[PDB]
Design a protein around this ligand. Structure first.
Ligand SMILES: CCC(=O)SCCNC(=O)CCNC(=O)[C@H](O)C(C)(C)COP(=O)(O)OP(=O)(O)OC[C@H]1O[C@@H](n2cnc3c(N)ncnc32)[C@H](O)[C@@H]1OP(=O)(O)O
Ligand SMILES: *C(=O)CCCC[C@@H]1SC[C@@H]2NC(=O)N[C@@H]21
Ligand SMILES: *C(=O)CCCC[C@@H]1SC[C@@H]2NC(=O)N[C@@H]21
Lengths: 507, 182, 179, 148, 91
């Protein structure tokens, strides 16, 4: 047997991975293999595989038997491009030892993590694992620690995207907590530390796999997964589209792409969206879609914390991040869940030089013991902090309500904002007329007559604007034109801040 | 200038284009402003300026002047295109995506658009209907009132009302059934 | 309390404290005895994954001296969360009662020998070899195994020589904590 | 057998290294052992040994033999002071596999190299080796590259 | 200020002092300007200012005034000391 024959035999096995029968089962379950997923994700022919001939060095439990060694050791690693842009990937292969993590497994992932940080290219992981490989014991625990160290080091340096394409258990479930975005596949992917078998054995509770850690749970209730997609093919198609929004590294400006949508057009549809009656809700998404280039908007966590909307869009070709209230849900109030999603999004966009647009319509905070005992104070500070420390352009437009401390939390001008616009329907006050007048004229006669005078003078955006809180009051139809003008001149903005080893977020 | 971008040299686009119940084999190539498209062996030349932002896209297909509108697009290949007044649904996958997509399980969920539930806790202040009333898509059915607002619940189904489960003056929570349609 | 398990509330308090001390150059001492994470739907639906990442992040990004001593249990992913050496730690000591493993003998042996006869006999051999701090120490996970009475002396020695420690990290506008 | 007994037995073997008969030959040739050399070099009582319980993982050509395991894997590493000034040291032990370099051997030396660079303290090496440990093959070549 | 230096707390110096053909057991301790030295059981007190650069070192040993010269020193313990005119080699 020549060396070339041995090489060819290893190449053929590396492509089969766990073997054709396991691949057959992989498809029966409705899943693609790790290599098929990469072929879909990356530009055709752009993928270059690294370390395809690496095998484990294990010896206990008869794991050093021939029928036990596989080339690639359960991960496919390499580099490629999406639409001409460099990206690093890795994908875990469930058909080889259940996708469990070995020492060598982690080493290969770390290698990719180090090349991407050095050059400044994003890393996209496709995760699917049964947890640690117990045959090696403590070697796999060091594997996790090294991966975690790279994921922390890369934070704020390169984007880190993690798409879950199957179950994930043990220590593996923490890597999506360190990356920027986590995506899942409905009814296929899971995230949990221990399985239902442990829950039943430890405590008298009955739960199944989908209930414990299914995609629907994490995208609707726990707030862990940013979005779930119907199947593997649609998940990767949307991932390519998402990729096109982000810079390659934090040293780069927000990408600018060819755009055919005139930057100076008006949107007459905005003038009548906001009702004159204060108790009538409207859909904030109608405003967002009409302003953004070609009415394309990428919504994050559509089913979690619906009272606040965050997502990506482009204006005049440039990627921007959008944050705003949704008056339809809980009157547009802030609560614990909305502050968590908001602060996380704002901080990512600031780290990677993506401008922020804020659409404010917030009457205050969600009251009640459910929020008080939940630490609403500690959690609300997260969104205020995320805006106050931002150094990227911030353009705020107030569409209607801004009462109380929520005015400042939703990126008010006095938090180093660049511009602040009000629509004619905006009203900025410490509280509404009823509270303010009954408190001011407490115990006085003819309070209702005093309220009429108070409403005429203060129930409008003018007592704030004349003091410098608002830069202009614009016809809503011109909102897009005004924002476009600001974005194209604030893009060269640079500011300094006192040196600090690191930031200290309230947590 | 830090990270050179290299445009993939794609000479031919091999697509699998699914219409109503048929899947067609289409291969396209770009020659500038005109795409040469082979549709199941038929050669067509589609010339345009391809301004992708305009609501009205004017194309010339083998000398035939057409106006089309693209109403929606999805990353998964779904496109809604209005052609001669009628909206057609087309799912365009690449050859590779179409070949692998056959391995996906055809799971089907239930359409429960007749079951109208409260999206938000509060007091019911208006119901626009009684059983037998006609309902249009987007029609207001119930109004709830919490934190002195008027959350409006609309129907997602055309038909008539079968039962009204919550009346004005009643207090409802999240997920409670308000009205049931036929 | 709760067998020493990690949960949402403990991760929040821990991460906040660790981050402050790192920012103001205050060394960290870690006393590890953690069997894993608090199970149950109360924690799963509460975002235990998202919240546990807060404590791991706070330790991993630290640049101040970190001295860890393991007094007894360190099972599973909790080993790394509680400032393990592979997160740029300075020293890691074990007491003779420490045990470092992916899981306890019962889970590990029944999974390894799943469907086999005489599992209990195999468990006896497994416990004798792995139910101790040695399979981790011989691989470089632990720097020494010390008599507990000397813990103070060892820590004092490390603190007075790690105080001049300086490290570099790649430049980043700001950190991006998992939240 | 308790864990404390096993620990004490490993401590006693780590101090003997290659064994008393090897040590006897070491003196016959007119050489000190690696641990005796450190005791002379550093301020009395200042030396703290690191990773004394680390053993090789290599299994091949009968290396997996318990009779083939030596705690310390042929190097003594640690830190101390000379006249009150911090210094890092390591010393290669010729009595254990001829002082040959293994993967784990290099790893321990690299660990000292990294702590010394981070704090800013000199490193003094006491070298004595027969070369690469051929039983591991290419693992020892990576060891050299990391040290370099 | 970057690297604190900690003076070893050496209470006693245990020396093996080889002269011509004899090896003597000497234990010394410092009490400031005077060293208390036990030489094979004999107690001596050597008081001086210990200016180590001068060619002439004046010492007082149990009240006896001596002048000595240190001519050479080696790291290996060898010292050449002139005592009453004669150079003695001590290791
Ligand atoms: C706690 C600290 C850590 O981070 S270490 C935690 C390790 N504990 C675990 O995750 C236990 C492993 N199993 C599970 O968690 C769940 O039952 C999983 C496997 C995720 C559910 O997936 P499910 O679709 O049921 O797969 P399965 O159980 O049929 O396994 C598929 C094939 O993979 C294998 N496999 C799985 N896990 C491991 C593992 N840890 N070590 C070695 N092999 C593993 C299974 O044996 C199976 O292979 P086969 O089909 O039997 O030929
Ligand atoms: C009705 O008269 C009172 C409504 C309750 C007050 C509302 S609830 C949400 C806003 N936040 C706040 O502190 N008060 C407002
Ligand atoms: C009894 O046999 C089972 C106890 C339950 C498992 C415990 S609960 C806390 C630890 N974390 C974990 O994932 N498992 C351990």
């Amino acid at each position: 047997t020549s060396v070339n024959e041995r090489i060819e035999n290893k190449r053929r096995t590396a492509l089969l991975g766990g073997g054709q029968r396991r691949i057959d089962a992989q498809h029966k379950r409705g899943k693609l293999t790790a290599r098929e997923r990469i072929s879909l994700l990356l530009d055709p022919g752009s993928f270059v595989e690294s370390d395809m001939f690496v095998e484990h060095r294990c010896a206990d439990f008869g794991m050093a038997a021939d029928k036990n060694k596989f080339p690639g050791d359960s991960v496919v690693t390499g580099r490629g491009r999406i639409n001409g842009r460099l990206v690093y990937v890795f994908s875990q292969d469930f058909t080889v030892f259940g996708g469990s993590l070995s020492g060598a497994h982690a080493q290969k992932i770390c290698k990719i993590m180090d090349q991407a940080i050095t050059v400044g290219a994003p890393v996209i992981g496709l995760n699917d694992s049964g947890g640690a490989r117990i045959q090696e014991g403590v070697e796999s625990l060091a594997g996790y620690a090294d991966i975690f160290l790279r994921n922390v080091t890369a934070s704020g340096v390169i984007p880190q995207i993690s798409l879950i394409m199957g179950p994930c258990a043990g220590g593996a479930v923490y890597s999506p907590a360190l990356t920027d975005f986590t995506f899942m596949v409905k009814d296929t992917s899971y995230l949990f530390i221990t399985g239902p078998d442990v829950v039943k054995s430890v405590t008298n509770e009955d739960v199944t796999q989908e209930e414990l850690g299914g995609a629907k749970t994490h995208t609707t209730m726990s707030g862990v997964a940013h979005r779930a997609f119907e199947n593997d093919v649609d998940a990767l198609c949307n991932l390519r589209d998402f990729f096109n929004y982000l810079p390659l590294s934090s040293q780069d400006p927000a990408p600018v792409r060819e755009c055919h949508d005139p930057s100076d057009r008006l949107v007459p549809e905005l003038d009548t969206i906001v009702p004159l009656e204060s108790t009538k809700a409207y859909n904030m998404v109608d405003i967002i879609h009409s302003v953004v280039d070609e009415r394309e908007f990428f919504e994050i966590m559509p089913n979690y914390a619906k009272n606040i909307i965050v997502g990506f869009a482009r204006m005049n070709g440039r990627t921007v991040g959008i944050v705003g209230n949704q008056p339809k849900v809980a009157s547009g109030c802030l609560d614990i869940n909305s502050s968590v999603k908001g602060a996380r999004f704002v901080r990512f966009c600031d780290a990677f030089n993506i401008p922020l647009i804020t659409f404010v319509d917030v009457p205050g905070f969600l009251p009640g013991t459910a929020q008080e005992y939940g630490g609403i104070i500690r959690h609300g500070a997260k969104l205020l902090y995320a805006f106050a420390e931002a150094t990227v352009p911030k353009v705020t437009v107030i569409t209607r309500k801004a009462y109380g401390g929520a005015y400042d939390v939703m990126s008010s001008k006095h938090l180093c904002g660049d511009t602040n616009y009000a629509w004619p329907t905006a009203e900025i006050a410490v509280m509404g007329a009823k509270g303010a007048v009954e408190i001011i004229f407490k115990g006085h006669e003819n309070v209702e007559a005093a309220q009429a005078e108070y409403i005429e003078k203060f129930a409008n955006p003018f007592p704030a604007a004349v003091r410098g809180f608002v830069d202009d009051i614009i016809q809503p139809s011109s909102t897009r034109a005004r924002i476009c003008c600001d974005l194209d001149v604030l893009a060269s903005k640079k500011v300094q801040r006192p040196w600090r080893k690191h930031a200290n977020i309230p947590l | 200038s830090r990270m050179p971008v290299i445009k993939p040299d794609i000479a031919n686009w091999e697509l699998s284009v699914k219409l109503h119940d048929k899947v067609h084999t289409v291969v396209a190539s770009n020659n500038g402003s005109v795409f040469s498209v082979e549709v199941d062996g038929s050669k067509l030349n589609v010339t345009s300026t391809w301004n992708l932002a305009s609501p009205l896209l004017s194309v010339s297909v083998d000398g035939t002047q057409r106006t089309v509108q693209c109403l929606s697009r999805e990353a998964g290949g779904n496109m809604s295109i209005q052609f001669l007044g009628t909206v057609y649904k087309v799912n365009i996958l690449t050859r590779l995506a179409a070949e692998l997509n056959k391995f996906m399980l055809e799971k089907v969920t239930e359409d429960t658009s007749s079951v109208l539930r409260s999206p938000m806790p509060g007091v019911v202040v208006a119901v626009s209907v009684k059983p037998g009333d006609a309902v249009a898509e987007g029609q207001e059915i119930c109004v709830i009132e919490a934190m002195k607002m008027q959350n409006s619940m609309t129907a997602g189904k055309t038909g008539t009302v079968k039962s009204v489960h919550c009346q004005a003056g009643d207090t409802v929570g999240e997920g409670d059934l308000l009205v049931e349609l036929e």
